[PDB]
Amino acid sequence: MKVAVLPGDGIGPEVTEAALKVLRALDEAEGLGLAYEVFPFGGAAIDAFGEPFPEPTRKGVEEAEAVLLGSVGGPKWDGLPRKIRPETGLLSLRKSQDLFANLRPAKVFPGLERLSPLKEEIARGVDVLIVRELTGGIYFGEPRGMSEAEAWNTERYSKPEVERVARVAFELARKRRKHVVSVDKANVLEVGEFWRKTVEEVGRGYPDVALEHQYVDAMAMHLVRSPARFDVVVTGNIFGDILSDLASVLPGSLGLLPSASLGRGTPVFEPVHGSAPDIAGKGIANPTAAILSAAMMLEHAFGLVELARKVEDAVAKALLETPPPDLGGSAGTEAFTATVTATVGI
Amino acid sequence: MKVAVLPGDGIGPEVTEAALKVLRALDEAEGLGLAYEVFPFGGAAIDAFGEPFPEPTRKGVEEAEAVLLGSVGGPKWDGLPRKIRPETGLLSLRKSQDLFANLRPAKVFPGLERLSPLKEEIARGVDVLIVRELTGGIYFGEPRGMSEAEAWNTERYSKPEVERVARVAFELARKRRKHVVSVDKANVLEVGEFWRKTVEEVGRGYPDVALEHQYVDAMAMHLVRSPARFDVVVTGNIFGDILSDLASVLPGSLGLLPSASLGRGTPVFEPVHGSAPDIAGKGIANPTAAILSAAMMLEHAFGLVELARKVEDAVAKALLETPPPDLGGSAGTEAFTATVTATVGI
């Protein structure tokens, strides 16, 4: 269990350490042989090496089995050349490991339905995993450009690209509730027909997984109307950007959202939240997102499904009995973390 | 008041008639000189002419000052060549009248918050008007196409296109609550920067209207988390498709959503719902959408703002007194129409 830890900026370092205390207690009580090394990344790397992704950290991630990343970026570096700013580092890390599938789950823990913008009866049970293609689509498609008279961008997709995301989505569904919803705009766009047909062929190799297809517009309605019926959802870059943000509001607090990036190389698990400079080091930060990110790591990097679920359960229990400030509670980083460990240990 | 009525298929004919009763009453007790002739359109046209947009209907539209359209399409015609299917008749209609702005309001009437997927406190007050560009974007952008190895589609936009839809949005804001939110993807795509910049210039001629910009992914979250703060929203074709559908779930029943298409030619007003072939003619269909569509027609096609709002407010009064089956009530098409007529006459 080789973990390259990239704590990052702002509250990253401290929430990441919260996640590590949880892992260290699990590894100690169950003997998981966890081994990790922390490497400089983000602004932290910029300030100590002149760039976001320094060689040592590059090698550090190649050699690890998984990467636990904290928050990256902050006002202190947003004014540097694009090619050396934090967000850039994330670009080169993802690319160095050929990561093409962004994993964004959204789950309403039992008893926390009240937090949802949705009515209670419709929030209950939500547990959807949104898989978003990262390497291509209109976000990268060419030609792109703009004149004084007009602008253009191209939504382009190759079969290999759709195929790899699709595969990851089916695999994921297997170890889940065996359902996959592939979302596209096939009723009007060629790339939607192509995507649809590709995901269809690929799904043939996964008979044990029920494959449903829906349109993006229809999907947006479905995630507010009845999100609880979906398990895994896969779709291209932009629709994936929109659908995961949509699903992200379902639970009701950003500080809970974990995330993962799977690909050909080393998998990256990190919180969705930002660095939150103004509260860094004040021990207020809700570590939930980083912990759940460590939980996603256990499961997807090391196939420890049951234990991961054990960590998730414990954090769900903690947000109920000792909620952190952002949930209207008074449990700070340190205290919340102990609660989670307890609920894991008991 | 020349109104070309295109009843369509399924429950279109019957909800259209319900809207007609309401107009007839209003034109009788107010002497508005309502004149109208019904023309074949959709499957109804295919079955009696061999196409969805026959010549008589084409001339009917150019000669009228507005078009009140019912439901178009159904299983009975989905299997025909694209060029003559119902959905294609709408395409040709839109284009015959160079209609470039699609108006889709979504409103939670007071007392009907329970109906919404959203919690009570968030649904209360929603009254958003989504304006979607119809004539261009990726939906029609070239190059488009697909090979065995890949597929591509182009999101393209010219200044005039963005300009005309923007204007429409500002005008509409003026007569409303004076606020417009232009939605794009300007922090990643050139068309997004070009769209932002163009709506910016256009807005300069509308100082009285507060112009806010938001990203589509951000907008999806905003619509679920706090829709009540929006007034008018404008954006391109595809994002417009998605955001309208997302906002459309807010009221908690598709049977209430009216819609309109404005442009250089005859305006079209029609409900958002489908033809519902299984309950067609059973007098169960909720006419609300068709009536509100007739109310939008009075306002936009003939400038009778106050009257239209009289229709809307009667409609809202009815949904409370005698709700239709889709609101968990037992008021059929005929009976609910009476109720509306009543609150409008009272």
From Swiss-Prot, chains A, B:
Pathway stated in the Swiss-Prot or TrEMBL entry: Amino-acid biosynthesis; L-leucine biosynthesis; L-leucine from 3-methyl-2-oxobutanoate: step 3/4
Catalytic activity: (2R,3S)-3-isopropylmalate + NAD(+) = 4-methyl-2-oxopentanoate + CO2 + NADH
Required cofactor names: Mg(2+); Mn(2+)
Family membership: Belongs to the isocitrate and isopropylmalate dehydrogenases family. LeuB type 1 subfamily.
Binding, Mg(2+): D217, D241, D245
Keywords, sorted A to Z: Amino-acid biosynthesis, Branched-chain amino acid biosynthesis, Cytoplasm, Leucine biosynthesis, Magnesium, Manganese, Metal-binding, NAD, Oxidoreductase
Binding site for NAD(+): 74-87, 274-286
Annotated protein name in UniProt: 3-isopropylmalate dehydrogenase
Self-association state and partner proteins as the record states: Homodimer.
Source species taxonomy: Bacteria, Thermotogati, Deinococcota, Deinococci, Thermales
Resulting phenotype, Y139F: Large decrease in activity and a small decrease in substrate affinity
GO cellular component: cytosol
EC id: 1.1.1.85
Signal peptide limits: none
Residues involved in substrate binding: R94, R104, R132, D217
Cofactor-binding details, from the entry: Binds 1 Mg(2+) or Mn(2+) ion per subunit.
GO biological process: L-leucine biosynthetic process
Location(s) in or outside the cell: Cytoplasm
Function comment: Catalyzes the oxidation of 3-carboxy-2-hydroxy-4-methylpentanoate (3-isopropylmalate) to 3-carboxy-4-methyl-2-oxopentanoate. The product decarboxylates to 4-methyl-2 oxopentanoate.
Main location: cytoplasm
Alphabetized GO MF terms: 3-isopropylmalate dehydrogenase activity; identical protein binding; magnesium ion binding; NAD binding
Site feature: Important for catalysis: Y139, K185
InterPro entries: IsoCit/isopropylmalate_DH_CS, IsoPropMal-DH-like_dom, Isopropylmalate_DH
